[PDB]
Design a protein around this ligand. Structure first.
Ligand code: PMP
Ligand code: PMP
Lengths: 328, 328
């Protein structure tokens, strides 16, 4: 393969078989476009999601360093903190989570239910902060405290979106390419774009495996101006570590996340209702509902390169449905 | 070979590949015994569970008879209603759910979060009743009213547990035999025993594929005296349908569900905490927490036939964690 360098990296096995790639016949009949879905929401640990693919690489690295503790950061309802805390429990590592409340809510289900409930079941040590103004710096400061309490911490950045963690999405792109050879004319792929490892890993893999496909990131927290340089830097870092070329443009749509990270919106929630009622698929208010709202509007406004099939990357997130209900 | 008549029943494809069968090393270390887990909680539709295995057969049968509406019953937080509603939404079938509040709670997360919240996403028609005093009669009365609107209803009993729904768990037993072949010599299998389709279908399959394995049902709702005839009637009806005999004794432990169906207990809670903290695995207060508290106590009191490996069937249930929090 041109991606054989992927095999050099130590990785734990958290997923196993390739997740399903399915046609959505009802959604496709409704929108008048062929739509497929990559089910990375079915990864098998603690209600699943896209970060288990990153943690395969990140946590192998932690064990190679002989760490006994994983430290990461996110919102109170972060799916990434959730998955990290579940993998720590599975492997008998301590977990420390630096959390913020990004939306100033006092609603009890946001503060205590959904992913935050699961953190307690996993004996995660919780450190609250007023704001994740500089997450890398704050995690480093924290890790140095914890190391001085007798532990050996390993720091996973927000979203696990380092180049190493993003190799999980180069892996997802290999599965996608294998599964789409039985999909005449896949034109576009749509994914939420936040901390950017998913988007950037897909970007590097799909450039090599499926070069005619257009990868669109629907932003969940930032403008195209603020987000593009982030995704490009990661794209280049991953491709460097794989000794691959990466010249593809990064495409981002920023119209779908207002009024901010972590705040549900109407088109988001209508997309969650559409996917649940037509296909029995569960999206989420923060990431995948907004990304799907984007895919749907892309159809409406003819925003894609052509009218051909569209593959949606389901990255997970559905446990937050229970935290966001009935409102925040 | 002896389960061959199983291929005669039409069945839809909901599950796809065999679900994981995993060793639990951290729980095995704590309990002093080899514990493996069959991950039927990762079946890929709408948060998963044991009922997708029965719905493959039941919904195939609905479609063959030209039915366009599924009608079933359970508690407000039933996982079975939730799975049925999701498969209905996926196939463009109407779904009507007769629900009761079995525990008399007014707690808002029980009334409106968890599985209950998912049903509204799947456009389920909800029919409340005061109590499921005669669910088969009550479903028929409902079906008469629904047919009067021009719908073509197919009634699925509580839990899906007819002999035909049970065939899902005869199939499960084939998977488990294959997965354990030349990998582990199982001694015992533990599963929750409620409406009894899972218990009975495993009983038939295991008697024929792994006749020396002891299968233990842990009741979730009834004493041994009240539950055993239900499991035996299914067991015999399933065997009848497959042209087989089933001479095995049904085994049931009833010490772990008090004070009743859907009421959490301390040992259940402690089993949920142990599995999350040691293995990153999520159980549930109604079914699997109680079945795992039974497994634990079975080991503590030497209730099993020997000291050999035990397979726990994880039948799902975790969305209820969000409905039971913070209390009922
Ligand atoms: C469900 C879900 N989907 C998408 C994303 C965005 O993935 P990325 O962080 O790789 O941009 C996340 C981030 N935690 C997520 O949790
Ligand atoms: C999670 C869970 N586990 C176990 C059971 C009991 O299975 P059965 O009805 O086949 O006895 C149920 C019933 N719906 C369930 O939801």
């Amino acid at each position: 393969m041109p991606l054989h360098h992927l095999t050099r990296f130590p990785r734990l096995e958290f997923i196993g078989a390739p997740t399903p790639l399915e046609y959505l016949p009802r959604l496709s009949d409704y929108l008048g476009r062929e739509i497929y879905i990559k089910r990375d929401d079915v990864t098998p640990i603690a209600m699943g999601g896209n970060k288990l693919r990153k943690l395969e690489f990140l946590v192998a690295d932690a064990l190679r360093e002989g760490a006994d503790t994983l430290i990461t950061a996110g919102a109170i309802q972060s799916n990434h903190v959730r998955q990290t805390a579940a993998v720590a429990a599975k492997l008998g590592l301590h977990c420390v989570a630096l959390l913020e409340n990004p939306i100033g809510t006092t609603a009890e289900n946001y503060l205590t239910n959904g992913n935050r409930l699961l953190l307690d079941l996993f004996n995660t040590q919780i450190e609250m902060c007023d704001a994740l103004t500089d997450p890398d710096a704050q995690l480093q400061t924290l890790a140095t405290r914890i190391e001085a309490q007798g532990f050996r911490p390993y720091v996973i950045p927000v979203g696990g979106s380092s180049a190493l963690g993003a190799m999980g999405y180069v892996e997802s792109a290999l599965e996608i390419a294998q599964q789409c050879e039985e999909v005449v004319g896949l034109s576009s792929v749509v994914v939420a774009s936040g901390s950017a490892g998913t988007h950037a890993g897909l970007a590097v893999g799909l450039e090599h495996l499926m070069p005619d496909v257009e990868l669109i990131g629907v932003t969940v927290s930032r403008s195209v101006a603020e987000q593009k340089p982030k995704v490009i830097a990661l794209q280049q870092a991953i491709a460097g570590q794989l000794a691959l070329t990466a010249t593809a443009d990064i495409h981002l749509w920023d119209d779908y996340f207002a009024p901010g990270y972590g705040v549900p919106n109407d088109a988001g929630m209508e997309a969650v209702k559409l996917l649940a009622s037509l296909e029995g698929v569960l999206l989420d208010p923060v990431y995948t509902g907004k990304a799907m709202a984007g895919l749907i509007d892309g159809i409406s406004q003819k925003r894609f390169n052509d009218d051909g099939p569209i593959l949606f990357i389901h990255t997970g997130g559905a446990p937050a449905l229970f935290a966001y209900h009935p409102h925040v």
